[PDB]
């Protein structure tokens, strides 16, 4: 819905202001890391299936109450859903990393996620653990500090995008808490 | 399965045997509809590929089903003919609805009343009135499942909104047939990350579409409205009212209390001798069977049963509104407040010891199964 | 779940009618069939630890590759996870002998197997080798009745046919 | 207790009182032959609904002018009010049987009955004929000489209470003479 | 097993109380006349919805000012509350017929009900007539001398149970007045 | 949904336990009254149209306040609804007699029946009296004590199924109370 | 039509799957029930002219008002229409004793009865007077076996409950 260029136009629509040379250079800096953001989204979706499968099994291996019967990841259909439930979280933070602001996931992924997991009986403390693994791994890829997979890049700074995707992964955690 | 060109099946109207398939998808409804310019574009058969036609049929007709790859082969039967052009996408959702994968997550698991409300949510993309339910609940009583899904797909409301080539979606048309019918549609259709499977009782539109008044709550309609049409009103003002309609909409807090069933109880300081307000209106719910030697006697305490406000409506007001000709012949004022009151001895039966008698005065009127 | 009763009760309800004389006739078969399959259940429940022990390692005897490092069986505990992974399958075919239909096997063991065994790299050909080792090891005079060996084998190959 | 039973009657409002079994044996000791007298009231008021529905029906079969149009038992407003005066004689003679006096019968019921029957046009020669059937009905019930409903009883003699109620029924008829 | 019945009727932590097959004859040997006492409650609770709808309408057709403007059974917020309150008296008195004690009836149902009805402005003139119909309605069902419904029973006498509820309805008439 | 066979697996699924020979004989006892259950459902749907038409008209003939105008069962549409409304209760209790446990009608018929009848304005005390007639005739058929219709059967005891259907019909009554 | 086979082979097709062990078990009931009802069909086919002669007239013995002029029975030939109009029902009870379900009874005799019997002024109470007169005259020693008379009565009252 709203990207990063369209975020400042609704900040300027509330003032009825022509967007000009006092904040275009703040948006010209966004295009200055245009390729830095562009390589960052590609590294998330490069190893995207190994992202979520390590993340949900790391949530299982620290808490085996879900594999116990009565747990919410006991049966085979629910593990197939929980592999796919965390995949949609990766699919929308990769949208919001590309769009530059948390607007595309806040209404398509977060609007309605809390009452779906309450009425299902999903343990909310475990899904907090499930997405915080994905916070620690998405900053491990775009800082190129992944130990088992190193990708080649043009060398430089990328920690401004590291707090960007880490701000998104606490937005999915706040709406489920 | 039938033919590589088939516009309509089952020969319900006579003029479908001569009816062509639509050569192009139908247009949008011609009213203004300020909401739909913020909405995403509708997906049809002849603009989009089979990767996203299958997803939006899962996102609208299946609700949010999470069909697996080994799950739903009946849909994989019906999808394999739609890619071959063997049936239109209007007939495809008829084949989806009549299939058992639609039945085994919406028909057997939901309730009888909720199955109709989910059918208007999936097929027509709205929520019905009470008269639309009452004509659809008799098809589930006399004709069953297959004729009830025929009432949506062979209706004229479907063919004007979508036709033969357009996937079902929430059609904002601006000028509606009722002002309720906008916001009951909107409440029935939330956005992403919601399904129908956890709410085995839906319980909120099952009691707004039940009585024809008591339109639903505003935060239950400001929630799924689109964006730059909700904002500056969902930062923290109605946001805590939302994050509540969500812990109540989730887990299905039954709206006997605040929605319909609206009784001004007395304050807790008024009785105070029949105290402990957890209790207060509890009775023994006793049941006997007395059949053979398995008949049991299940004496439960019942819950706080409320005055039902319609059994007190039919009777005590509509019923027994007699009380006529009450001059009752006022002659001689020796009485006192008790004109004709018998002493009314009433001997509690003399089981030979530890059983005793008390008396009470009362005004006595002869009944209507009495003299002549 | 998907039993013979839930087949005919939901079909009588999807037609919207009473239980007709076909539906009362369908349950009359279960008197003639539960006398054979319920003693196959207690022969499975009284011998469930042996049929996981000496038949779960036959997948490793056939597929001796996967105890190599970098693969699906790394250490000793994932092999202990693997004998837990097949004990649920032998629980579920015990859970379908007692029902009479294939009800508890589909949504609890089958539905979603194409997803979780593809993402977690679990080879389904090593699953079905352990199950078909149990399938051809049935016989009349030792194991069970001559009739219960038909239907106990008739649930196991449905697990073969759904996993492959 | 009998003063508490006096508080049931005279209060000019609806009131009710019972007597427990510890308090009951004090009442049987205070009154004389009270197991007959508690059986005496219970013979009458268990058949009181047929007693007034036969006596005022027997008043009609001896004087059919009350079902003439314009007669005083013609409409069902008046017919139900004739049985309402029929029962309220019968309760007030039963408590007068129960207390053993007639002072509650005079002061609560019969003070002002002549002043209210002439003012209402009630036929006093016909209502004396109605209460004399109820005198004749109650002496059959008190001696178990009813021909239809005969009741079980601890045997003995209760002809002293047969003469007690006939001294109560003519006190009604002398009050409306 | 009556402790289990008495603990659930004073609203302790159980939800309901079921009596089995072997416990039911154990309950029948506990109280006296266990076959007739279970038949008496089965006559009451099968017609509880008919009895309180007749007794409230019997209360209105005696004193018709309750549904006049200014009455207590005008404004059908109140009229559904009075139709509730007749059922709560009938459901507590049918337990006391089953248990054989009025001890549940005095401490759960009747203490402070005189104080509650003067605080709510409930008139005690008509509320006694609501109970006095329901005494006569319950005592006609027990000896099967109802006018319309004649229910089938094993034949015999039930008048010891019929005078038991007249003592139990008199305790409602004592505690309201 | 859950039949009598699948009720003992979901109790055993929470324990992760194999179904063994300690409770299989309890399930093999259920198959021993297989033909006893099978004739019982056939005797219910034999006279099923005469079941509900005697039940609703019996509810009318004891409480004629719904036929009065303003009543719930006044007009010709709502009586056609009410003859249909009691027919669904007969249709789903007969499913629970065939399935052996109250699990098919609990989540389909009773789930949301309470606020459906409140919001439409169904008199809930008359709905108790509606299905209590359907309780007392369901045990009248499967014990074959029905006077006007006697059906031939193989002789034996069937009172274990009579407590089964009488435990279903007050589950409907508790879900609507 | 709606048999016990076509119930479970359409519910397997609407799910889109193979005939499982729940579907194979329902046909095993037909081994135990076809000995009972196929004897009843031969007792019905060998006595069909008797059970419409001395049982079709019993509606007219109950309803002698129908033979009045201006009614549904006017002349001799509509009474000869009527015994044909009842013999088609007894052919249909014979047509469903050999199926096992209520298949040929529904769309051939029931589905559409509320239309043609209301428009042409035929009282359906005088239909079910003739049908239930055949229902109460079943007995074990003369007519059939003890089990055939249960099922033959179980298809008659389904026709009573459909028309009433
Ligand atoms: C108003 C003018 C007026 C009334 C309303 C009506 C009230 C009333 N009813 C009775 C007596 C009984 N009511 C009974 C209850 C029922 N009878 C039934 O058959 C059904 C099942 C059920 C609900 C309607 C019963 C069993 C009785 C006793 C016997 C009988 O049938 O009459 C009374 C009399 C109470 C008394 O005498 O104290 C009254 C006042 N009568 C009105 O006059
Ligand atoms: C109700 C049926 C009671 C009941 C009451 C008794 N009535 C007794 C006597 C009696 N009854 C009448 C009226 C009756 N006789 C008629 O000729 C006509 C119609 C014209 C009617 C309605 C009369 C006149 C009498 C005689 C008394 C008198 O004349 O004063 C009676 C005593 C019987 C007896 O005399 O042996 C009783 C007990 N009877 C019952 O059992 C039920 C409970
Ligand atoms: C940050 C998370 C990374 C990182 C990013 C940098 N990228 C730099 C230059 C650069 N990046 C791309 C990638 C992008 N362009 C494409 O065409 C496609 C595929 C469709 C992708 C994914 C390109 C072409 C360039 C060249 C631009 C240029 O040098 O002129 C870069 C250098 C500075 C800059 O140009 O922004 C950085 C720092 N490098 C890292 O170390 C982390 C891991
Ligand atoms: C395989 C042994 C054949 C062959 C098969 C192909 N079939 C193709 C499409 C297709 N097939 C059917 C019939 C099938 N689907 C049904 O739903 C039913 C009955 C209910 C049946 C028997 C349909 C209806 C369709 C169209 C739907 C679709 O295309 O998915 C197909 C794809 C053609 C293509 O696009 O290339 C193939 C290859 N063809 C062969 O060469 C061997 C002999
Ligand atoms: C008759 C014994 C009752 C009574 C019944 C009424 N029910 C009315 C509507 C209604 N009832 C239900 C519940 C029932 N129908 C179903 O389809 C299912 C299961 C799937 C059940 C349990 C529903 C869902 C509805 C709404 C649909 C409809 O209105 O047809 C009703 C109509 C009210 C009106 O509009 O006037 C009546 C009268 N009411 C009574 O007084 C007796 C006690
Ligand atoms: C007075 C209220 C009645 C009356 C009562 C009698 N009932 C007699 C026997 C009896 N009653 C029942 C049913 C009861 N027992 C239970 O265990 C249950 C619940 C599970 C109930 C409702 C049974 C089972 C029996 C035993 C024999 C039978 O099956 O009928 C009875 C005879 C014994 C005795 O004299 O004490 C009486 C008198 N009968 C009446 O005439 C009034 C109306
Ligand atoms: C019946 C056998 C008589 C008869 C009776 C009528 N009485 C009428 C009214 C009436 N009666 C009384 C006295 C009565 N009420 C009491 O509260 C007490 C004791 C404290 C007694 C003795 C009163 C006070 C009233 C007027 C109050 C009222 O009823 O509203 C009456 C109605 C007359 C009318 O409606 O115009 C009748 C018909 N009349 C007869 O024909 C026979 C002899
Ligand atoms: C039937 C197919 C043959 C047969 C095979 C043999 N099995 C032998 C030993 C053995 N078998 C099993 C599995 C068995 N136990 C079970 O609980 C079930 C299923 C319910 C099965 C199939 C086990 C665990 C063992 C080890 C020793 C034991 O526990 O009995 C065997 C001996 C040689 C060997 O170990 O391979 C043979 C020949 N036996 C027969 O008689 C028929 C022909
Ligand atoms: C003349 C009117 C009667 C008659 C009266 C007698 N009753 C006798 C004894 C008696 N009566 C009762 C029941 C009564 N007493 C009470 O305390 C209560 C209420 C709680 C009532 C209804 C009892 C319990 C007894 C005692 C029986 C016993 O213990 O054996 C009686 C015997 C002498 C006496 O005790 O007064 C007489 C003469 N008896 C008749 O035959 C005519 C018809
Ligand atoms: C009806 C026959 C009466 C009458 C009744 C009214 N009661 C009203 C409120 C009320 N009643 C009770 C007592 C009842 N509830 C219990 O839990 C128990 C037993 C433990 C009993 C006996 C309570 C506690 C309350 C207040 C609490 C509440 O209703 O939420 C009432 C409403 C008063 C008003 O709104 O003004 C009425 C009308 N009034 C009558 O006229 C007849 C005699
Ligand atoms: C209990 C509520 C009944 C009752 C039941 C008994 N049935 C007995 C035997 C039995 N029942 C059937 C009926 C069933 N079989 C069918 O083929 C069809 C229709 C397709 C139905 C509905 C059959 C065949 C049999 C014979 C079984 C046999 O004897 O081998 C029976 C005897 C004991 C038993 O076998 O369970 C009883 C007690 N009988 C009653 O008196 C009540 C009313
Ligand atoms: C069984 C309930 C009784 C019984 C009844 C009698 N029936 C008598 C004559 C009769 N019965 C029938 C109907 C019969 N024929 C059939 O083809 C079938 C079913 C396929 C049935 C039930 C007819 C047509 C007739 C007329 C003469 C005849 O053909 O038998 C009868 C003789 C007296 C009479 O005519 O009413 C009796 C007593 N018979 C029994 O043995 C058991 C007790
Ligand atoms: C042609 C001339 C002519 C008459 C002779 C009278 C005849 C007469 N009197 C009464 C009617 C009556 N008559 C009496 C009179 C008596 N009842 C008693 O118990 C007393 C002993 C006695 C009088 C001494 C009473 C009490 C009524 C009923 C009162 C009334 O009808 O209003 C009625 C009934 C009227 C009605 O139904 O309302 C008639 C027709 N009227 C006439 O138009
Ligand atoms: C005021 C009007 C009025 C009615 C309409 C009836 C309605 C009616 N019937 C029964 C009671 C019953 N109703 C039936 C039903 C039937 N019996 C048959 O033989 C047929 C198959 C079917 C009706 C067509 C049965 C079997 C009983 C049990 C008593 C009996 O065997 O007759 C009951 C008692 C229910 C209970 O005990 O809880 C009532 C109220 N009774 C009334 O008082």
Closest-CA residue to C20 (of B368, E56, E68, G7): G7
The DSSP symbol for G68 reads S
Q: Which residues contact C93 (CB under 8 A, 6 or more apart)?
A: C44, C105, C152, C155, C156, C159
E158 to chain D, any CB pair closer than 8 A? The answer is no
Place of tokens 């995207």: A48
Q: Round to whole Å and give the CA distance between D56 and D62.
A: 10
Q: Round to whole Å and give the CA distance between C27 and F3.
A: 12
Could you tell me if the CB of D72 is within 6 A of ligand 7? yes
Interaxial angle between packed helices F124-142 and F34-46, expressed in degrees from 0 to 180 and rounded to the nearest 10: 120
Q: C48-67 in b/e burial notation, b at 16+ Cβ within 10 A?
A: beebbeebbeebbeebeebe
Mutation pick for ligand 13 pocket among D64, D71, D73, D118 (CB with most ligand atoms within 8 Å) = D71
Which residues of B have a CB under 8 Å from any CB of G? 72-77, 98-101, 103-104
Chains E and C touch (3+ CB pairs under 8 A): no
- How many C-beta atoms lie closer than 10 Å to residue D160's C-beta? 12
| CA closest to F63 among chain B residues | B315
Q: Which residues of B touch E87 (CB under 8 A)?
A: 283, 305
Nearest CA to ligand 4 atom 17: B77
Nearest CA to ligand 8 atom 43: C139
C142 vs chain F: nearest CA distance in angstroms?
Answer: 19
Nearest to B250 among A2, A84, A119 (CB): A119
- How many C-beta atoms lie closer than 10 Å to residue G112's C-beta? 10
Q: Round to whole Å and give the CA distance between F20 and B162.
A: 56
Any bridge partners for residue C150, and if so which? none
Task: State the CATH number of the domain containing residue D16.
Answer: 1.10.490.20
Ligand nearest E148 Cα, by number?
Answer: 1
Could you tell me if the CB of F144 is within 6 A of ligand 11? yes
Phi, psi for B284 (deg, rounded to 5): -70, 120
- Ramachandran assignment for C12, one of left (phi > 0), alpha (psi -120 to 50 degrees), beta (any other): alpha
Are E174 and D13 inside 8 Å of each other by CB?
no
Cβ atoms of G104 and G1 closer than 8 Å: yes
Nearest to F46 among G149, G154, G164 (CB): G154
The vertex-E102 CA angle with E101 and E103, nearest 5°, equals 90
Report how far apart, in Å, the C-alpha atoms of E17 and of each of B285, C96, D132, E107 are.
10, 35, 57, 20
Cβ atoms of F72 and B314 closer than 8 Å: yes
Nearest CA to ligand 7 atom 6: D82
Q: Round to whole Å and give the CA distance between D126 and D106.
A: 21
Task: Report the sign of the C-alpha dihedral through residues A118, A120, A123, A129, in that order.
Answer: negative
Three-state DSSP class for residue B242:
helix
- How many C-beta atoms lie closer than 10 Å to residue A62's C-beta? 10
Q: Which tokens go with B183?
A: 């916001």
Give the distance from CA C146 to its chain's centroid: 19
Ligand nearest F31 Cα, by number?
Answer: 11
Q: Round to whole Å and give the CA distance between A16 and B141.
A: 60
Cβ atoms of C141 and C163 closer than 8 Å: no
A49 vs chain C: nearest CA distance in angstroms?
Answer: 7
Q: Round to whole Å and give the CA distance between A40 and B266.
A: 64
Q: Which residues of G touch B73 (CB under 8 A)?
A: 15-17
Closest-CA residue to F169 (of F142, F133, F140, F119): F133
Three-state DSSP class for residue B68:
coil
Q: Round to whole Å and give the CA distance between F166 and F145.
A: 15
Closest-CA residue to G56 (of G37, G81, G74, G77): G81
Task: Report the sign of the C-alpha dihedral through residues G149, C27, F107, B181, in that order.
Answer: negative
Ligand nearest A146 Cα, by number?
Answer: 3
CB-side neighbour CA atoms (13 Å) of E17:
24
Phi, psi for B270 (deg, rounded to 5): -75, -35
Contacting chains of B (3 CB pairs or more, <8 Å) are A, C, D, E, F, G
Which residues 70-129 on chain E approach chain D with CB closer than 8 angstroms?
Answer: 124-126, 128-129
Say how many Å lie between the CA of residue D153 and the centre of ligand 9: 7
Closest-CA residue to G20 (of C110, F38, F29, C36): C110
Which residues 20-49 on chain C approach chain F with CB closer than 8 angstroms?
Answer: 21, 23-24, 27-28, 30-31, 34-35, 38, 41-42, 44-46, 48
Domain, as residue range, for C124: 1-164
Task: Give one DSSP letter per residue of A57-101, joined into a string.
Answer: HHHHHH-TTSSSBTBTT-SHHHHHHHHHHHHHHHHHHHHHHHHSS
Nearest to C10 among B108, B140, B142 (CB): B108
Breaks (C-N over 2.5 A) in chain A follow: none
Chains F and B touch (3+ CB pairs under 8 A): yes
Q: Round to whole Å and give the CA distance between B146 and B42.
A: 27
Q: Which tokens go with G41?
A: 């069909």
- How many C-beta atoms lie closer than 10 Å to residue C139's C-beta? 10
A74 vs chain F: nearest CA distance in angstroms?
Answer: 10
The total number of structural domains that make up chain F: 1
The total number of structural domains that make up chain C: 1
Structural element, H or E, at residue F132: helix F124-142
Could you tell me if the CB of D137 is within 6 A of ligand 2? yes
Cβ atoms of C95 and A60 closer than 8 Å: no
Cβ atoms of D72 and D123 closer than 8 Å: yes
Q: Round to whole Å and give the CA distance between B287 and D121.
A: 54
Task: Report the sign of the C-alpha dihedral through residues A55, A57, A59, A62, in that order.
Answer: negative
Q: Round to whole Å and give the CA distance between E109 and B274.
A: 7
By CB atoms closer than 10 A (0-12, 13-18, 19+), residue E77 is middle
Q: Which residues of F touch E53 (CB under 8 A)?
A: 63, 65, 125
Tell me whether residue E82 is annotated as binding: yes
The DSSP symbol for F127 reads H
CB-side neighbour CA atoms (13 Å) of F39:
21
Report how far apart, in Å, the C-alpha atoms of G55 and of each of A90, G58, G128 are.
77, 5, 11
Mutation pick for ligand 10 pocket among B270, B271, B279, B363 (CB with most ligand atoms within 8 Å) = B271
Q: Round to whole Å and give the CA distance between C34 and C40.
A: 10
How many helices, marked H, and strands, marked E, lie in chain E? Answer: 9, 0
Candidates D14, D57, D111, D172: best to mutate against B (most CBs of B within 10 A) is D14
Q: Round to whole Å and give the CA distance between B368 and C3.
A: 58
Could you tell me if the CB of E46 is within 6 A of ligand 6? no
Domain, as residue range, for D42: 1-177
Cβ atoms of B300 and E15 closer than 8 Å: yes
Nearest CA to ligand 12 atom 6: G137
- How many C-beta atoms lie closer than 10 Å to residue B266's C-beta? 12
Q: Which tokens go with E89?
A: 């008296």
Are G25 and C158 inside 8 Å of each other by CB?
no
Cβ atoms of E100 and B351 closer than 8 Å: no
Q: Which tokens go with E36?
A: 């007739």
Q: Which residues of B touch F99 (CB under 8 A)?
A: none
Any bridge partners for residue B284, and if so which? B301
Structural element, H or E, at residue D15: strand D15-17
Which residues of B have a CB under 8 Å from any CB of C? 68-71, 103, 107-108, 140-146
Greatest CA separation for chain B: 99
CB-side neighbour CA atoms (13 Å) of C103:
25
Say how many Å lie between the CA of residue G91 and the centre of ligand 12: 20
Place of tokens 């097709």: G13
Q: Round to whole Å and give the CA distance between B61 and B94.
A: 10
Cβ atoms of C13 and C23 closer than 8 Å: no
A69 to chain F, any CB pair closer than 8 A? The answer is yes
Q: Where does chain B show beta strands of DSSP type E?
A: 284-285, 300-301, 341-342, 359-363
- Ramachandran assignment for B289, one of left (phi > 0), alpha (psi -120 to 50 degrees), beta (any other): alpha
In this structure, chain E runs to a length of 177
Q: Which residues of B touch C13 (CB under 8 A)?
A: 108
Closest-CA residue to D54 (of D88, D93, D83): D83
Specify the experimental method: cryo-EM
Structural element, H or E, at residue F78: helix F76-99
């Amino acid at each position: 819905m709203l990207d990063a260029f369209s975020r400042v136009v609704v900040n300027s629509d509330a003032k009825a202001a022509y967007v000009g040379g006092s904040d275009l250079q703040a948006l010209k800096s966004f295009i200055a890391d245009g390729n830095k953001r562009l390589d960052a989204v590609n590294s998330i979706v490069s190893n995207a299936s190994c992202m979520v499968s390590d993340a949900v099994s790391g949530m299982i291996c620290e808490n085996p109450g879900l594999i116990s019967p009565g747990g919410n990841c006991y049966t085979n259909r629910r593990m197939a859903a929980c592999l796919r439930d965390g995949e949609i979280i990766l699919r929308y933070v990769s949208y919001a990393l590309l769009a530059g602001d948390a607007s595309v996931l806040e209404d398509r992924c977060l609007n309605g996620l809390k009452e779906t997991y309450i009425a299902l009986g999903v343990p909310t403390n475990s899904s907090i653990r499930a997405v915080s693994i994905m916070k620690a791994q998405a900053v491990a890829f775009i800082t190129n500090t992944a130990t088992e997979r190193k990708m080649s890049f043009a060398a430089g700074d990328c920690t401004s995008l590291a707090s960007e995707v880490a701000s998104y992964f606490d937005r999915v955690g706040a709406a489920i808490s | 399965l039938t033919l590589p060109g088939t516009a309509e099946t089952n020969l319900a109207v006579p003029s479908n045997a001569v009816r062509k398939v639509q050569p192009y998808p139908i247009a949008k409804p011609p009213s203004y509809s300020s909401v739909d310019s913020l909405r995403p574009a509708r997906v049809s058969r002849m603009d989009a590929d089979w990767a996203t036609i299958y997803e939006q049929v899962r996102r609208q007709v299946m609700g949010n089903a999470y069909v697996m790859e080994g799950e739903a082969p009946d849909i994989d039967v019906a999808f394999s003919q739609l890619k071959g052009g063997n049936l239109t996408v209007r007939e495809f959702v008829r084949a989806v609805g009549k299939s058992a994968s639609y039945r085994t997550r919406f028909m057997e698991a939901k309730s009888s009343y909720n199955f109709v409300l989910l059918n208007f949510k999936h097929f027509l993309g709205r929520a019905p009135t009470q008269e639309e339910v009452s004509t659809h609940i008799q098809i589930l009583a006399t004709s069953g499942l297959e004729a009830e899904i025929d009432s949506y797909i062979d209706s004229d409301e479907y063919k004007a909104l979508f036709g033969d080539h357009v996937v079902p979606y929430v059609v904002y048309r601006g000028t509606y047939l009722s002002s309720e019918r906008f916001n009951r549609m909107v409440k029935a259709n939330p956005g992403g990350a919601t399904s129908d499977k956890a709410k085995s009782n839906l319980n909120m539109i099952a009691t707004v579409a039940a009585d024809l008044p008591t339109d639903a709550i505003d935060v239950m309609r400001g929630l799924p409205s689109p964006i730059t049409s909700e904002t500056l009103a969902f930062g923290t003002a109605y946001y805590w009212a939302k994050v509540e309609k969500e812990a109540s909409e989730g887990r299905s807090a039954s709206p006997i209390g605040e929605k319909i069933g609206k009784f001004d109880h007395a304050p807790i300081s008024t009785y105070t001798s029949l105290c402990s307000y957890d209790k207060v209106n509890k009775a023994p719910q006793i049941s006997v069977t007395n059949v053979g030697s398995d008949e049991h006697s299940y004496v439960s305490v019942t819950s706080k049963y409320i005055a039902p406000d319609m059994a007190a409506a039919a009777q005590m007001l509509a019923d027994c509104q007699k009380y006529k000709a009450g001059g009752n012949a006022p002659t001689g004022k020796w009485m006192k407040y008790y004109p004709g009151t018998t002493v009314n001895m009433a001997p509690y039966i003399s089981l030979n010891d530890t059983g005793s008698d008390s008396s009470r005065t009362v005004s006595v009127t002869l009944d209507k199964v009495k003299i002549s | 779940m998907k039993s013979v009763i839930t087949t005919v009760v939901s079909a009588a309800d999807a037609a919207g009618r009473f239980p007709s004389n076909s539906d009362l006739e369908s349950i009359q078969g279960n008197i003639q069939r539960s006398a054979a399959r319920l003693e196959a259940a207690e022969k499975l429940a009284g011998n469930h630890e042996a049929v996981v022990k000496e038949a779960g390692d036959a997948c490793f005897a056939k597929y001796a590759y996967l105890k190599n490092p970098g693969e699906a069986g790394e250490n000793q505990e994932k092999i202990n996870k693997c004998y837990r992974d097949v004990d649920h399958y032998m629980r579920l075919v015990n859970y379908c002998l007692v029902v009479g239909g294939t009800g508890p096997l589909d949504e609890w063991g089958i539905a979603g197997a194409r997803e979780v065994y593809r993402t977690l790299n679990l080879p389904t050909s090593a699953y079905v080798a352990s199950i078909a080792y149990t399938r051809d090891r049935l016989c009349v005079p030792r194991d069970m009745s001559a009739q219960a060996g038909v239907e106990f084998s008739a649930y196991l190959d449905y697990l073969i046919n759904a996993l492959s």
